[PDB]
Amino acid sequence: AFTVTVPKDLYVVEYGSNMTIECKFPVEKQLDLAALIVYWEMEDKNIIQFVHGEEDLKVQHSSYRQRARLLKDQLSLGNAALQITDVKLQDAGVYRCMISYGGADYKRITVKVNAPYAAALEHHHH
Amino acid sequence: AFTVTVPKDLYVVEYGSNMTIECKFPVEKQLDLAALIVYWEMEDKNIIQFVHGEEDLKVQHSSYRQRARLLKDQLSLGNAALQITDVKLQDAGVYRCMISYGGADYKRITVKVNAPYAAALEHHH
Ligand SMILES: Cc1c(COc2cc(OCc3cccc(C#N)c3)c(CN3C[C@H](O)C[C@H]3C(=O)O)cc2Cl)cccc1-c1ccc2c(c1)OCCO2
């Protein structure tokens, strides 16, 4: 069966830092981009949509616009890697990677965000 | 772009009753069963896994054994219908139909379960 695997299902990230979260998928001889679909979301909010060679970048939910991207070079290695920069408290939660490549699967990754009082206070109130 | 559609977003069902929840996907002329994958889940629990034209029996979550099935006849018409019998309070929540058919998409369906006090009390513990 087509299986997606996750080397780390838990990530601890410091507020303001950047993170790369990964989902692995099997690629046999060489990757066929045209047959690949990669989708990332966090709590029903679209983050990455890569379809048959192209990403619909602008559909990324507003909270992530200009903040997250898929490392395209990694796909040829069978690694769907999502990089999010300038991590916020709001970024904490359960991420899902949905992959279709001659079969389909998805996995969950949990992200925890540590933050100092100043950031926490802002998040708390605003 | 491949799109899955749900005519009905919300289902309100009575405890002990039956429900059929539907997700629609486009089938051009004749269904190519080999390319189709239909997956149904609620809160990460596997309900249905239709791959290769066949349901995966041992993969369904225990809470749904004998109560849930995909109506195979409907697939050819581009309808993935999940039929659940003997609805429980535990069945209330957000369902997801994930479909791969020469493209991929998913949709969410919300189910609310009405129940009498006795059933509710048992659920409450
Ligand atoms: C993801 C996807 C599916 C997933 O369909 C399956 C999921 C499966 O599990 C999901 C699962 C099960 C249990 C735990 C987790 C976690 N945490 C995840 C299995 C059970 N699986 C059998 C294998 O052994 C793996 C195994 C498992 O890992 O448990 C089999 C199938 Cl067919 C089906 C159809 C479409 C898409 C998809 C892909 C990309 C998309 C998209 C939809 O729409 C939007 C655009 O992009």
Residue numbers in the entry:
A (entry chain A): 18 to 143
B (entry chain B): 18 to 142
Original paper wording:
The PD-1/PD-L1 axis is responsible for inhibiting excessive stimulation and normally aims at maintaining immune tolerance to self-antigens by negatively regulating the immune response. By blocking the PD-1/PD-L1 interaction, activation of T cells can be achieved for an improved antitumor response. Therefore, the immune checkpoint blockade (ICB) of PD-1 or PD-L1 at the tumor cell–T cell interface has become an attractive strategy for cancer immunotherapy. Although the PD-1/PD-L1 interface is considered difficult to treat with SMIs due to its large, flat surface of interaction with no visible binding pockets, the number of patents and publications on anti-PD-L1 SMIs is constantly growing.
